[PDB]
Design a protein around this ligand. Structure first.
Ligand SMILES: CCCCCCCCCCCCCCCCCC(=O)O[C@@H](COC(=O)CCCCCCCCCCCCCCC)COP(=O)(O)OCC[N+](C)(C)C
Ligand SMILES: CCCCCCCCCCCC(=O)SCCNC(=O)CCNC(=O)[C@H](O)C(C)(C)COP(=O)(O)O
Lengths: 615, 46, 76, 67, 47, 51, 243, 84, 109
């Protein structure tokens, strides 16, 4: 029963990819959807058997690496944190498979798409259910590979190839970080299993010799794990691959670039809660980077004019808040935001994909105008998604998006006020662009061409049912989960999370916080909505199009080009390494100096020495 | 080369804002005492 | 695909849509069910579940290991 | 089945293959070869040897000669 | 308007109106015409 | 459907607009009901009987 | 690239490590520096290659150099991972060079730029090449990962600097491996010099099947291989180490 | 993907040049040049080409966009493209 | 004089400049209602002089116009999706014209 959940997608993809000719372009899709749907059904069964019926099940298949106390095994970890992640990943995967039967119906390569996403779902199930680092690393590298593959779905696209390669580059930097962290765990605790490090992670307090100075092990391991997760969680170190990775198909950008793999590092750091807890130094940089990214994405996403690109910055902002909520030792609030976000953000992408499918793929908000009554269902879907994105009061967004800032204020440190300031400020920009998306599209006099208007063709049945399910989710899931995940002492995280008694700002927050701060995110959101209305519907002659010469248009280029960081990083690291990979080595090494004074360059004196001994 | 200064300047804004948080000293203005728990602040539990 | 109809395309060509795919789909579901039966049998055979459930869960209908790990001293 | 192999490719391929004829010990390239031939190996050698020395210092054991 | 090219653009794209979609400002919140009515009826009905 | 002067759009489906309107109405009702019940709780007007 | 590159490592594991134990300790840092600089230099050199053969010949050099880092780090993890990665390379490099050979025996180019976007024409070879260059990446579940990660673990038991450079070797190894994969199997076709060309016949599609099964058997269950060697490796590491 | 024939294009192409009021919408021909017969400037000609660009969704490259000064060349160029 | 070759580059340069300026101001003006006055002013600007005869007042004017245009590029201009630079060019491209694939290869004798 419990082994099935992770192997149905794998087996279904294997058969649908090896024998995709037999099942055709539709049988493969429907069977993959069937397999993932029953996987989600057994995931719900496991959720009932584990979450409500609190009893974690543990099963071990066979040792993977049976060396000197490196006993990595194929065992599985099914705790409360695992099941709440499963009921997200497999549910969203099944609904995206349903969505992609009709969306990916005119395309030739239908079975390959299904098999790709199904092996990817298997990899991420292995990640989530993994009992030790190596299995977790296996699923993590597998999901990275599958993300690269889906970016590379249209191989003939030259831009998509480069985007996938750059995504692989940043993912491999993350691989470096996380592999070093994982191995550093073994050199300390002589194990990689979750249940051993957590049981004994407080005893050691020694400092290591890590190649430059003497550093504490736990702090060093946590820093290395963060360097591993920066690429996967899309943090300040390396997160330039999300906006450029939207060249792939919409459903994968809908399914995965918004729900779980972007939060895969979040789930990883939450899983190892009683390892980051003993290093207060690490939590500082976690909060710092979370605020940094939540501000960067919000600032960069306000001047974008692309349908599928502007929302990627919103997803990056959400990742920033998730990392911040992780750094406050309140991962329960972080996973609460995770489950709230996985509904409405996926809903927003699915509605956008439904719109873009009907308008013949014209993802430029400069074009679409007022045809909201043409697409009322999708309008309602994305309205629910965007309102949950705002944190609309008494909706699934408010139960986390306001509580995170409230907890941010209640902690008093140097970086705490900084991070709280950035989180409060980012609300304005996030609301501004999330409302400009609804304003410049479907709420202004139309500018789209007649050839796209005449098409119409409202979203059919296959890609409307998942939209309906996500809409009904991101309207009541937050309310039904607020009490049962964060209930001021609920029995939902017996072994999934370790809450430090000292860094436990939950009880004092709700009562000692002023009433004014509990409503100021709402005021910021309303201010952003009013600003968007002014600049997009009334005052758009100078506030939207400014004919400035200097010092103002460069500001327009600054936010649009993402602080020019996509160019500085390239020219300063990738270009430099590309040049110096050959310039030094292939010229002044290998064949060269080792050759001119080596085999036959000038040591072949015998040819010049031949006609001197016959005298 | 012009784009390079924005990365230094942009990070300069954050450390400048980070310096402001240092000068603000949010840590010492807590309206609450440190938490107290029974059994010697859970000494046997730790 | 003018030439693409000549390649084998193990997972399916550009637009294959074979003459009889529904029967292949049905036999595929039957094969998946047959191959996942032993997976279920193995899963029910190895599952510890150290803690007893608070309420009767749909488990313990095929799983017999319940509360078998509250003896953490005779462990190899 | 053999490729056309147009003429504007094999010349560059042989130039990449036969680069051994273009080397005249220019001073800038002499510094470039010298640094990556000696200094970086020396720097990394000091790195590992001092890492071993610092590891042995904490344990208190005398340092190996490491010739 | 006047300017020898603004009017030229306006004349050809007079279909941009399409009265059903010239101004979708009445339907910003399509469910508020019935939602508030249902809410108020329940408010006065339960009491 | 019909064309204005060269652009014609298919009529939106009945099973789409009806569900959109009804679902918007029900979420508005849920929002307003949640405001009625625990509105004073999050605005500090009254505490949930804990003091 | 399948056997001859093993003579040096096997000779080190037979007549160098046991007979000269304290000499091995005294020469340990020098080998670390040589292997690290070899890994880095070869990785940077191989990413600007146009020869269809050297592109993976340098990968072989990088893997063999990474072998010595844990082979000379006296440890049960290091040596065990050394032989496991050695067998893994003996399989994966052989498979890659067979793929290059079949590519060359049809077109006779010995270049990289000529081939491009042939996935629509040879899908079976595309999948096989993807799996082989995927194993070269050192994915967990493939042959190279278990051995190579064991080498990293064993070296990090001894030293903390050099094998971090070894791990940095794979931050570019995987990158240029997928980039090399994308030169050939991706993009639009160029039927200006690729008029006619076929896919693998019955011989060379079956020849890879032992490679595939051995690769997956390495990846998912390497216990049987580690089972037969833990006595010999432990005896090797403890020789002349009385205490 | 209907591959609309020329007879389905000879009206929308003529619509923009009929809507052009600087010249009388009474002496326009499918074969006419705006530089001599209809007497247009050297600047307003590209305005009609751009208007066609919004009329029919297709990007005409900058290289030969200005070479189309006759109404025959515009319809010919939009018809010659397959995906028009 | 009387050589249109020298007078040529002025005409195509100014016409292409008008085209690209119209494209960039359409990029700037998301709403077509505010685009009307912007386009009117843009065409008036190119018609301000409209009467140059001398060979000294032709190259400097176009150079100044091009240099000022270099300051306004609108980093993200609109591109048709299937155009060379859009979101759907080379998505599912038509197969090339002619290639053949043989079947019997590597047989015996
Ligand atoms: C160390 C390995 C660990 C395991 C990794 C497994 C991950 C999957 C590895 C293969 C992924 C597929 C990549 C194949 C090459 C991609 C391009 C290609 O050639 O695709 C082939 C084949 O497509 C496939 O992807 C089939 C391969 C199987 C994919 C599914 C893999 C499932 C089994 C692996 C995972 C099993 C579970 C784990 C096992 C323990 C043809 O595609 P068509 O759609 O037919 O295009 C037609 C070409 N043309 C237009 C020109 C006419
Ligand atoms: C942020 C940057 C600040 C703002 C930047 C704004 C940039 C403004 C650029 C302005 C550049 C100009 O004025 S460009 C204006 C150039 N105008 C001319 O050359 C007039 C030449 N006239 C003629 O040749 C004949 O009358 C005739 C053949 C009939 C006409 O045909 P043509 O027309 O083919 O020439």
């Amino acid at each position: 029963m419990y082994l099935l959940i992770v192997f149905l997608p794998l087996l279904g993809s294997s058969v649908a990819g090896f024998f995709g000719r037999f099942l055709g372009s539709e049988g493969s899709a429907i069977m993959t959807t069937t397999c993932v749907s029953f996987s989600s059904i057994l995931s719900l069964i496991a959720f009932y058997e584990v979450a409500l019926g609190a009893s974690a099940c543990y099963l071990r298949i066979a040792p993977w690496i049976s060396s000197e106390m490196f006993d990595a095994s194929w065992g599985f970890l099914f705790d409360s944190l695992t099941v709440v992640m499963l009921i997200v990943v497999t549910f969203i995967s099944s609904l995206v498979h349903l969505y992609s039967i009709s969306y990916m119906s005119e395309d030739p390569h239908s079975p390959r798409f299904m098999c790709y996403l199904s092996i990817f779902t298997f990899f991420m199930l292995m990640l989530v259910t993994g009992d030790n680092f190596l299995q977790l690393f296996l699923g993590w590298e597998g999901v990275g590979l599958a993300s690269y593959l889906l970016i590379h779905f249209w191989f003939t696209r030259l831009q998509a190839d480069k985007a996938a390669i750059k995504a692989m580059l940043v993912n491999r930097v993350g691989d470096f970080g996380l592999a070093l962290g994982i191995l550093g765990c073994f050199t300390l605790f002589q194990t990689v299993d979750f249940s051993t490090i957590f049981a004994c992670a407080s005893v050691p307090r020694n400092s290591w010799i890590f190649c430059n100075m003497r550093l504490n092990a736990i702090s060093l391991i946590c820093i290395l794990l963060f360097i591993g997760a920066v690429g996967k969680s899309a943090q300040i170190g390396l997160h330039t691959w999300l906006p450029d990775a939207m060249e792939g198909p919409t459903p994968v950008s809908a399914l995965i670039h918004a729900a779980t793999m972007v939060t895969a590092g979040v789930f990883m750091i939450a899983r190892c809660s009683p390892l980051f807890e003993y290093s207060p130094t690490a939590l500082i940089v976690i909060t710092f980077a979370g605020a940094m990214t939540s501000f960067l994405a919000a600032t960069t996403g306000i001047l974008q004019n692309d349908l599928k690109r502007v929302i990627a910055y919103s997803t990056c902002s959400q990742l920033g808040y998730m990392i911040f909520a992780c750094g406050i030792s309140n991962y329960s609030v972080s996973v609460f935001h995770l489950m709230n976000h996985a509904f409405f953000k996926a809903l927003l992408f699915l509605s956008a994909g439904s719109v873009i499918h009907a308008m013949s793929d014209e993802q430029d908000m400069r074009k679409m105008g007022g045809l909201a009554s043409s697409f009322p269902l999708t309008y309602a879907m994305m309205l629910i998604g965007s309102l949950s994105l705002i944190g609309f009061p008494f909706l699934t967004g408010f139960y986390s998006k306001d509580v995170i800032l409230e907890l941010a204020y209640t902690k008093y440190t140097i970086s705490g006020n900084f991070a709280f300031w950035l989180g409060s400020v980012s609300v304005l920009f996030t609301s501004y662009y999330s409302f400009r998306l609804l304003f410049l599209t479907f709420l202004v006099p139309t500018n789209s061409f007649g050839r796209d208007i005449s098409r119409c063709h409202d979203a059919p049945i296959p890609m409307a049912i998942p939209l309906i399910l996500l809409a009904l989710g991101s309207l009541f899931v937050g309310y039904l989960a607020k009490d049962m995940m964060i209930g001021l002492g609920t029995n939902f995280w017996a072994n999934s999370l370790l809450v430090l008694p000292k860094n436990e700002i939950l009880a004092e927050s709700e009562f000692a916080a002023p009433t004014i701060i509990k409503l100021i995110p709402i005021l910021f959101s309303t201010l952003g909505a009013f600003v968007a209305y002014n600049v997009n519907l009334v005052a758009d002659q100078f506030q939207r199009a400014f004919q400035t010469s200097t010092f103002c248009n460069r500001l327009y280029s600054f936010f649009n080009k993402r602080w020019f960081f996509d160019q500085v990083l390239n020219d300063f690291l990738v270009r430099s390494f590309l040049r110096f990979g050959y310039e030094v080595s292939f010229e002044a090494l290998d064949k060269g100096a080792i050759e001119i004074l080596g085999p036959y360059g000038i040591s072949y004196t015998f040819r010049r020495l031949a006609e001197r001994i016959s005298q | 080369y012009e784009a390079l200064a924005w990365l230094s300047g942009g990070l300069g804004f954050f450390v400048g804002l980070g310096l402001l948080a240092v000068l603000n000293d949010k840590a010492s203005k807590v309206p609450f005492t440190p938490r107290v728990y029974p059994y010697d602040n859970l000494r046997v539990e730790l | 695909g003018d030439f693409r109809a000549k390649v084998w395309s193990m997972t399916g060509g550009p637009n294959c849509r074979p003459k009889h795919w529904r029967r292949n789909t049905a036999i595929a579901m039957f094969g998946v069910f047959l191959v996942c039966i032993p997976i279920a049998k193995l899963s029910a055979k190895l599952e510890q579940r150290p803690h007893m459930p608070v309420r009767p869960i749909p488990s313990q209908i095929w799983c017999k290991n319940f509360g078998t790990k509250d003896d953490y001293e005779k462990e190899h | 089945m053999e490729t056309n192999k147009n003429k504007f490719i094999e010349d560059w391929g042989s130039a990449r293959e036969n680069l051994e004829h273009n080397f005249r010990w220019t001073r800038r390239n002499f510094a470039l070869i010298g640094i990556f031939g000696i200094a970086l190996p020396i720097i990394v050698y000091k790195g590992i040897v001092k890492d071993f020395h610092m590891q042995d210092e904490d344990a208190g054991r005398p340092h190996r000669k490491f010739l | 308007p006047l300017g020898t090219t603004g009017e030229f653009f306006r004349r050809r794209d007079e279909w941009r109106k399409h009265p059903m979609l010239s101004n979708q400002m009445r339907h910003a919140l399509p469910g508020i015409g019935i939602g508030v009515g249902a809410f108020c009826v329940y408010l006065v009905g339960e009491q | 459907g019909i064309t204005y002067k060269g652009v014609t759009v298919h009529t939106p489906k009945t099973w789409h607009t009806v569900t959109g309107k009804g679902l918007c109405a029900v979420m508005w009702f849920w929002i307003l009901y949640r405001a009625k019940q625990d509105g004073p709780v999050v605005m500090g007007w009254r505490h949930p009987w804990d003091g | 690239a399948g056997i001859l590159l093993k003579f040096g490592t096997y000779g080190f594991l037979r007549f160098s490590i046991p007979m000269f134990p304290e000499a091995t300790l005294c020469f340990t840092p020098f080998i670390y520096t040589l292997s690290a600089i070899a890994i880095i230099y070869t990785s940077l050199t191989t990413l600007r290659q146009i020869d269809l053969k050297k592109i993976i010949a340098y990968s072989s050099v990088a893997h063999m150099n990474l072998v010595t880092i844990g082979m000379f780090s006296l440890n049960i993890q290091g040596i065990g991972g050394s032989i496991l990665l050695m067998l893994s390379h003996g399989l994966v490099s052989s498979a890659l060079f067979l793929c290059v050979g079949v590519l060359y025996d049809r077109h006779k180019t010995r270049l990289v730029r000529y081939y491009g976007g042939l996935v629509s024409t040879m899908p079976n070879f595309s999948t096989i090449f993807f799996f082989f260059t995927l194993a070269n990446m050192s994915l967990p579940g493939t042959s190279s990962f278990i051995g190579e990660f064991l080498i990293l673990v064993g070296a990090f038991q001894r030293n903390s600097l050099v094998a971090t450079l070894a791990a940095l070797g794979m931050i570019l190894g995987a990158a240029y491996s997928l980039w090399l994969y994308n030169r050939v199997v991706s993009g639009n076709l160029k039927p200006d010099f690729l008029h006619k060309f076929s896919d693998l016949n019955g011989r060379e599609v079956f020849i890879f099947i032992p490679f595939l099964v051995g690769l997956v058997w390495m990846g998912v269950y390497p216990k049987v291989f580690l089972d037969c060697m833990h006595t010999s490796v432990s005896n090797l590491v403890q020789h002349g180490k009385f205490h | 993907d209907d591959h609309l024939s020329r007879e389905a294009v000879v009206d929308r192409v003529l619509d923009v040049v009929k809507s052009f009021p600087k010249v009388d919408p009474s002496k326009v021909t499918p074969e006419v040049h705006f530089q001599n017969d209809l007497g247009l400037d050297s600047l307003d000609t590209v305005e009609i080409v751009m208007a066609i660009e919004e009329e029919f969704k297709l990007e005409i490259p900058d290289k030969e966009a200005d070479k189309i000064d006759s109404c025959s060349l515009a319809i010919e160029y939009v018809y010659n493209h397959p995906m028009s | 004089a009387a050589y249109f070759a020298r007078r040529a580059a002025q005409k195509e340069r100014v016409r292409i400049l008008y085209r690209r300026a119209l494209k960039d101001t359409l990029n700037w003006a998301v709403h077509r209602h505010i685009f009307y006055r912007d386009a009117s002013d843009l065409r008036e600007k190119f018609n301000v002089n409209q009467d140059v005869e001398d060979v000294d007042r032709i190259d400097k004017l176009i150079a100044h116009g091009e240099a000022e245009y270099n300051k306004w590029r609108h980093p993200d201009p609109y591109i048709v999706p299937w155009a060379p630079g859009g979101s759907k060019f080379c998505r599912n491209p038509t197969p090339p014209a002619g290639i053949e694939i043989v079947y019997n290869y590597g047989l015996e004798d």
